[PDB]
Nucleic acid binder design. Sequence first.
DNA 1: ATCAATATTTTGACTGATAGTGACCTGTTCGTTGCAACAAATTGATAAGCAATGCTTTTTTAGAATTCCAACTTATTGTAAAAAAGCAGGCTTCAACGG
Lengths: 55, 54, 94, 356, 178
Amino acid sequence: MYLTLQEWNARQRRPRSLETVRRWVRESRIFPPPVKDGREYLFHESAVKVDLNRP
Amino acid sequence: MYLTLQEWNARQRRPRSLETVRRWVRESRIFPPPVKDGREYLFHESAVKVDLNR
Amino acid sequence: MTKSELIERLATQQSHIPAKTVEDAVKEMLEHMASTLAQGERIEIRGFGSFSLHYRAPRTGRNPKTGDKVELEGKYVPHFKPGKELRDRANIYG
Amino acid sequence: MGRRRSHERRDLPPNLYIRNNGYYCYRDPRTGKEFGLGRDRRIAITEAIQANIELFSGHKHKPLTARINSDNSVTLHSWLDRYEKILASRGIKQKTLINYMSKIKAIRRGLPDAPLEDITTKEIAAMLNGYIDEGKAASAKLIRSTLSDAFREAIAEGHITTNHVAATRAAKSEVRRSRLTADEYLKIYQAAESSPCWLRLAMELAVVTGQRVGDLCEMKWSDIVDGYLYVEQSKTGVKIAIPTALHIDALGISMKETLDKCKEILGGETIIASTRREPLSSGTVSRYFMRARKASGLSFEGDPPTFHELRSLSARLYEKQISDKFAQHLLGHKSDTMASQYRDDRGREWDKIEIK
Amino acid sequence: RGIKQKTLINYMSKIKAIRRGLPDAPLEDITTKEIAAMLNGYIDEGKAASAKLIRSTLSDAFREAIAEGHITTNHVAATRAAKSEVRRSRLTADEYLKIYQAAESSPCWLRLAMELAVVTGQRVGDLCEMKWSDIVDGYLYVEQSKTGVKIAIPTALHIDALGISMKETLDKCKEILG
DNA sequence: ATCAATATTTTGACTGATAGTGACCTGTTCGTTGCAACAAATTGATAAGCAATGCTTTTTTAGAATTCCAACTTATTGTAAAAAAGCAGGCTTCAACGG
């Protein structure tokens, strides 16, 4: 089962903007990264945003 | 079940200023840490304060 | 001592180092030495030896099985010069 | 002490300190020593804080709406360790004991380290229901039962006086293991050609004898005398003798005909051996049976059947073939409760009624 | 809990009865006496069956209350449910014939519903959800709502005591009703 | 009911661990540096590799089968009071055989 860009963001702790979610995908802030299918992205069921930074 | 910084401060013994709430997170005075998700912390349903001293 | 037997002996000695690590380590070192000689650069390991590149002038080759003249280009050839420590320890005849 | 407080521990938990090298080390309240863990600040403190799940060290506890009733006692995580020392003396088979340990291990990573008269019924329900929301309902039932018998033996040793676990209910499973018809049987046997030869022979032998996959890999060619098949089940312990004259017309499989096939092609000490002439495990037989299932392409509703389902299909066939009492003694089963709960369909085939 | 609709309603009606049956005070204050005082009150009125469900439902509430940590004991497990005996008389062949004929003043679907309910022996609940699409090649696919059992009654049955035929009854419904 | 003595009621001394920082010691890593080792350059007689390319033999190669490891999902089975026999570890005496 693979959720879409909107469906995935509609299940997070706090729904954000479509363009915002698109930014994480480009910043690899989505583990695991979505898969390209057609024109939209397909995220994983247990997909959750992470922070690739160690201050 | 995870809540926001605003929703969490609403369910405490005494609601304080948002500034003070952010301070506790930075000073690591809550088990477990909120963990920044984007640009807004996400408290855990069991994340309570601890308070230190010297 | 083959490329595999070389990794086994080194892994047996080094116990504080994973056996799998020693395997890929040896393979990467050889590939590195093979790529360096491919680019044109020479290798020089003090105590071991050195890998240079000697030029070969283009000449009309031949077929030592049929006897047909075959064209040959320039091309370079890897050469190894034994080191000081290598020659002494190996030479068992003074 | 020499150093009560400092400007270094001021950002560190009670355990864990910081050396003159910017490194951190966590003390040990069992010897007074410590190990170096971490180079950063928010890492050593965020590491020496979950062991710190037990500051009892000050703080007490209280939820929303509750009562009070306590005094003093000891830990409990240790009781789970003493409970295992009691189960090993109850004289249990070497397979059931492992089933208990796995559950006790789940209780370890489920409930917080806590005394025994502290873990309220509400805390046990939060962990129990957590497995229900995941779908694992059959697990919550065993975890509850095990965690229930643990406290029972605890009260009998002067530690607890009540059994809070008996207050909460147990999940009710529905068994979503789809059955296997006779038509889907040939569909799998036909795709079992890519798989070894012992698979098809043991697949038919498991439907002609209606035995367990476990005892199916325990039968030798010495257990056959005067045309009988002496089989000793390990699960229950029942002893039966299967005649080598059985036959299933619904699939066209003869008992004797199937037996001989395992004597020529296979060959060995056991009826069902491997290509290396050696006995196989009970987990490898049903393993390859799966491959032919997925390779088939057929679809079901819920959870795909299994090699054990062959035992069920064997019973349903023998029913209409000969009689009902026949598909009861062969399965090494008695009583009168499962004989009916093994003939059902469970939302698959309509129970058609005929003029008879 | 995830149950049938009508089922959830049955329990609600029992809870409302408890509301006007017991005062509004802490659970730890409710005594076993008051519980039996209300219970027996419904037993004397003649409704012994209702007392059983109300007692079995009120008990479940407390058992789930202890799970939350509200109280410590279930003062309902100390009582005793009143054994009720079914007093709903059965029906004979002679009686049925006397009712079918008396159903003349009634519409033209009752008689058909009677013969059908006796020829199929199905429950009134599913008999109303039966469509003509259920009949497939001389069969009668019926999906019981209560239990959920799936059976197929062939259109060849016939009661040899009242003079009714499954086939003749079904076709009689296709002509009259429609 | 009031003396009278011992366990009772809070404080202080006792003895080594608890507490948390700091010094001790030196592996380990990095910058400065010294030096054996490496490279250019000769000259000339003698030893070793060389071009192509299919067939045969030796060594590395990517899976894939097999089985213990493992978190889950099923399948069966189900006893305790209450008596009243049934065995052996060693000291105890009668009963039979030999002088």
